[PDB]
């Protein structure tokens, strides 16, 4: 898709993640874990709620009858009414189809963008302490326990704390 993450470099979604739209899975010495990301999830949900608020509505214009349900209509006027009503129905049917097709394209691509934005936030946070594997994971070149993993998820990870250790493991370089 447009932003290359969902149905892209992320191989598949997680059916086990039920508490959010986007999130993290980690692996360290203590074991494995999973957690949803609130900010990216809510960013996507708020945008879809906004679309629904705009789309799920009717006009306030009051229309009256121009066609008798239980009686005959004039033939000349009736053909004009039939042409006009069918022309109006073709317009609304077309507009409905285009609305939902365009909105669906944008919704899918928006969701893709929020996945990428989270990935990009984490990449920049980790700085020179990690490398991308190409599948949506970061290989972290220092011991990163549950508290360290939490700091990455909470956006409080300080790269300077682990930089010396990480560069030694990545590049075999001592200061």
């Amino acid at each position: 898709g447009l932003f290359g993450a969902i149905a892209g470099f992320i191989e598949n979604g997680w059916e086990g993640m039920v508490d959010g739209w986007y999130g993290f899975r980690h692996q360290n010495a203590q074991g494995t874990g999973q957690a949803a990301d609130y900010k990216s999830t809510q960013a996507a949900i708020d945008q879809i709620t906004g679309k629904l608020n705009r789309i799920i509505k009717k006009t306030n214009t009051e229309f009256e009858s121009i066609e008798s349900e239980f009686s005959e209509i004039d033939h000349q006027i009736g053909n004009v009414i039939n042409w006009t009503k069918d022309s109006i129905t073709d317009i609304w049917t077309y507009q409905a189809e285009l609305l939902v097709a365009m909105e669906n394209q944008h919704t899918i691509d928006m969701a893709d963008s929020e996945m990428l934005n989270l990935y990009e936030r984490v990449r920049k946070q980790l700085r020179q302490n990690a490398e991308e594997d190409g599948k949506g994971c970061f290989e972290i070149y220092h011991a990163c326990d549950d508290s360290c993993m939490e700091s990455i998820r909470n956006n409080t990870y300080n790269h300077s704390q682990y930089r010396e250790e990480a560069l030694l493991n990545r590049l075999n370089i001592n200061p």
Partner: protein, 320 residues
């Protein structure tokens, strides 16, 4: 050897199919319908001073057909017309009928005002018919009078009657013309003289002649009574001059305010509210579109020729 943090997104076992600009079968995690397919099979009349006409046709309210006896006057914000409703107990029709019905169905009430028309001793003003039964006997349209010669065969006298609108709003006046089935019948009711009816106001002028002609019986009757109408402006007079054949008004109508006219087959429900109505009932949807009918009234979703149109409410579904 390195520790790992993996970014991901959710998925579901069974996704929903939607259409996009580039793909007719795109699977997403969730979607919602935008075209309403369901209707409530009642007329939701809560918060409305409504009138269900039943077997009374709107025009019958003005002329006083027996079916309309409970609907000669009143007020309403919503008027409900039913299928096969009765306007004409005696065989006939109204000239400019569609415009008249529309005007009544746009109104918010009817009041009635006496014309004050009187007739000399050689006129029988209480003509009745088997076609219009009321209270176990031959009757006639309640708001009109069938005028005939009291003595059979005698010439109906030249008569002139005037209705003045003394109100500050326009009134609607209706009258009929009787069209006999034969010369003998015409002679018996109105005499051998040439018949003519003229009607004249400051805004209206017309003349009418009873047409004698053989016709099939409708409810045992080859005669016809056709109705005509016009508006009488505030302060204006309307003058009827006639010598046989006029079905004369005893009252005129005043249409009051505005209301919503509904033609529907659905029963009334006073416990629920609605803004949108059609032949089959009420549409209380929040959705922008509907596929129930192109014929609706009120504040409605737009009709589309589509069974379903699903709006994505989630990302692409990529299952494990």
């Amino acid at each position: 050897d390195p520790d790992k943090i993996c970014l991901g997104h959710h998925a579901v076992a069974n996704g929903t199919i939607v259409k996009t600009l580039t793909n007719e079968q795109e699977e997403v995690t969730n979607a919602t319908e935008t075209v309403e397919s369901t209707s409530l099979n009642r007329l939701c009349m809560k918060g409305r001073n409504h009138k269900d006409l039943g077997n009374c046709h709107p025009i019958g309210m003005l002329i006083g057909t027996p079916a309309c006896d409970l609907h000669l006057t009143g007020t309403w914000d919503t008027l409900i017309e039913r299928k096969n409703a009765i306007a004409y107990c005696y065989p006939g029709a109204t000239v400019n009928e569609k415009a008249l019905r529309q005007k009544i169905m746009e109104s918010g009430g009817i009041s009635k005002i006496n014309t004050g028309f009187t007739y000399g001793s050689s006129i029988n003003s209480a003509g009745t018919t088997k076609a219009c039964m009321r209270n176990g006997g031959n009757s006639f349209y309640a708001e009109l009078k069938w005028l005939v010669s009291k003595n059979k065969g005698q010439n109906f006298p030249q008569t002139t009657n005037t209705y003045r609108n003394a109100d500050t709003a326009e009134h609607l006046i209706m009258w009929g013309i009787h069209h006999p089935s034969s010369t003998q019948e015409k002679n018996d009711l109105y005499g051998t003289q040439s018949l003519s009816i003229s009607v004249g106001s400051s805004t209206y002028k017309n003349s009418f002649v009873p047409v004698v002609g053989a016709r099939p019986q409708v409810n045992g009757l080859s005669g016809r009574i056709d109705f005509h109408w016009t508006l009488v402006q505030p302060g204006d007079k309307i003058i009827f001059s006639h010598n046989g054949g006029l079905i004369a008004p005893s009252r005129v109508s005043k249409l009051i305010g505005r209301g919503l006219g509904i033609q529907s087959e659905a029963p009334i429900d006073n416990s629920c509210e609605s803004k949108c109505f059609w032949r089959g009932g009420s549409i209380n949807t929040r959705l922008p579109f509907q596929n129930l009918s192109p014929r609706t009234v009120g504040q409605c979703p737009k009709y589309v020729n589509k069974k379903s149109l699903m709006l994505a409410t989630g990302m692409r579904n990529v299952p494990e």
